[PDB]
Amino acid sequence: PAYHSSLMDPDTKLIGNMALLPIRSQFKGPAPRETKDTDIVDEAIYYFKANVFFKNYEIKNEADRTLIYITLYISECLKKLQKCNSKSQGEKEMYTLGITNFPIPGEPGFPLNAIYAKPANKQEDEVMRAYLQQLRQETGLRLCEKVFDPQNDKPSKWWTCFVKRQFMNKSLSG
Amino acid sequence: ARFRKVDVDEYDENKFVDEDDGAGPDEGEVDSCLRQGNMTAALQAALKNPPINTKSQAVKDRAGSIVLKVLISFKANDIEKAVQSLDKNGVDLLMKYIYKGFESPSDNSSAVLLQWHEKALAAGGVGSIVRVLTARKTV
């Protein structure tokens, strides 16, 4: 069955009931700085091709909630990366995509509102809004070096073939 | 097993026993009527003093012959009238002899007997057949 994160730590902090996991990134946001050689974003990207076929998913950790968000987001990236012609161009669309305001727990339009805790106050809101954006930004640029073959204009079919598949049968554009 | 071979039920005092006791119609008389072409008259004589009480099948098989002899000698179109000349009791007795006859078919004997059945049924209803069925003393 489905792949779960092994990155939850006894000292990992929370933003809502999501795991405020560290990442290696220059993008701004409240994510802690990662010192190890892997982080939650690499994990989501590593597990994606398998996890995306799964229809059910057991939330074992608050890390899984973060892992799930990134998985759904990878799908959003593939939707955009599908229609583009160049590694350069793809990076720009991903910047744009990362910045756009996607729904967050508590809002209608966010699936999994039964499994994600909504932000309790305005601070909590804004901070979750910043984390989410910083995850998107790093996910998107990191995904570009994977999707494109050193042969420019090659959104690899081996990544494109998942454009129609929906992890857990849900969507962030839904 | 052996001890199971015996049917102890045949000696059960609580069973049911029919009331039995200890000659037939006049042969010569039936012949007279027949010889003279008096069919209805032969029918009425053949139906007299039936051996409803004898034990031997020989005497019963005798009356059935006489009665059957008469039914066979009959002309198809003259059956209805003879049957209608009988009283209800006669019709019931006739039905008993008819069924009797069905058990000794020979040539076209059943063919005319089916004609008799039809006419007898028309006269006595299904009730006359019912009385063939539950008679304990019969022809």
Binding site: - | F16, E19, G125, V126, G127, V130, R131, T134, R136
Partner: protein
């Protein structure tokens, strides 16, 4: 007036005193009680105790007690406490299925006919607080199929598979007392055989005493109806039918009987005392402004009778056996019919009755 309670047989029935409720056995181990609500029938009670099919039911009018008998060899007397019927076991001392049951008119005893070739006469002893029974045995040689009590509550008619209709004394001195003489005889010690029919043909499916008790009638499987006249030295009038055997019979006047059975419809018979003769006068099931309207024909199973399978029980609903005004039939079709004697007389200008 037909009503279908179900599509399997009604095995037996009984009505309460006021004819407001009917108890039926729907080919079951149970007895179901029905009552009208407006012009609809509604089930009001389910009596469940027997572990075999119920083959008889009788309802004592005044004491309002129901008695049932079944193939499980048991009989139960049911008493109504509040909103629920409660049974008491009555031991019949039999080793075969019970077949029929009737409360005596005095409601002090009931008689159960059985496959043990015996009649169990049961009564309550307010001394030991239980029901006891005495057997009437001799000379019954087969299953007892039907029973009917004389108005004196002593004499009891019985029909059995040994081809006989019998009258016995069921005299129990400890619940009643010396009965007045009757044309059936002066001596009525318990179990005394008062009368025995003289045919050896046909199971006797139903028996019935007249209103005054001086006459007894019975129908047999040999498609005959008979009537024994105690005022004529127990002379027996017989009538052989052209149709199928009758299963049930009742007097509607001292000289008139209604019967039904395998033909599926009720027929009328009349007794001419002078001639000592039974006559067929029947077939009572013949196919205002509302009536005229309802009967008008339309723009256009396959039986022409209300019941669609054999009728196995008839009971008088109103007027008694002396001047019955309404009677009831139940049958193997699961139907129950109510017949109105005056309506029948109106629809059949040629109708006799006496």
């Amino acid at each position: 007036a037909y009503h279908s309670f179900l599509v399997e047989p009604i095995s037996c029935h009984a009505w309460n005193k006021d004819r407001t409720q009917i108890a039926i056995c729907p080919n079951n181990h149970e007895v179901h009680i029905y009552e009208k609500s407006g012009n609809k029938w509604v089930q009001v009670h389910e009596l469940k105790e027997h572990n075999g099919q119920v083959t008889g039911v009788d309802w004592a009018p005044d004491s309002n007690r129901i008695v049932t008998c079944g193939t499980d060899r048991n009989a139960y007397v049911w008493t109504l406490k509040g909103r629920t019927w409660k049974p008491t076991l009555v031991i019949l001392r039999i080793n075969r299925a019970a077949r029929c049951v009737r409360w005596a008119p005095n409601e002090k005893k009931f008689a159960v006919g059985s496959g043990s070739r015996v009649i169990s006469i049961c009564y309550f002893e307010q001394e030991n607080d239980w029901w006891v029974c005495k057997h009437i045995k001799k000379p019954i040689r087969s299953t007892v199929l039907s029973l009917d009590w004389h108005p004196n509550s002593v004499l009891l008619a019985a029909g059995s598979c040994d081809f006989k209709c019998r009258i016995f004394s069921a005299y129990i001195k400890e619940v009643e007392e010396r009965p007045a003489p009757t044309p059936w005889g002066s001596k009525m010690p318990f179990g005394e055989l008062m009368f025995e029919s003289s045919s050896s043909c046909g199971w006797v499916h139903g028996v019935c005493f007249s209103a005054n008790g001086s006459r007894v009638a019975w129908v047999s499987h040999d498609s005959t109806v008979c009537l024994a006249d105690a005022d004529k030295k127990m002379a027996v009038a017989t009538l052989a039918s052209e149709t199928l055997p009758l299963l049930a019979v009742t007097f509607i006047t001292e000289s008139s009987l209604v019967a039904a059975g395998h033909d599926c419809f009720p027929v009328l018979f009349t007794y001419d005392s002078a001639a000592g003769k039974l006559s067929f006068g029947g077939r009572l099931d013949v196919p205002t402004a509302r009536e005229r309207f309802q009967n008008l024909d339309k723009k256009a199973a396959g039986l022409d009778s209300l019941h669609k399978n054999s009728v196995s029980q008839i009971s008088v609903l109103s007027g008694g056996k002396a001047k019955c005004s309404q009677f009831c039939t139940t049958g193997m079709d699961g139907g129950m019919s109510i017949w109105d004697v005056r309506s029948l007389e109106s629809a059949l200008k040629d109708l006799k009755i006496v």
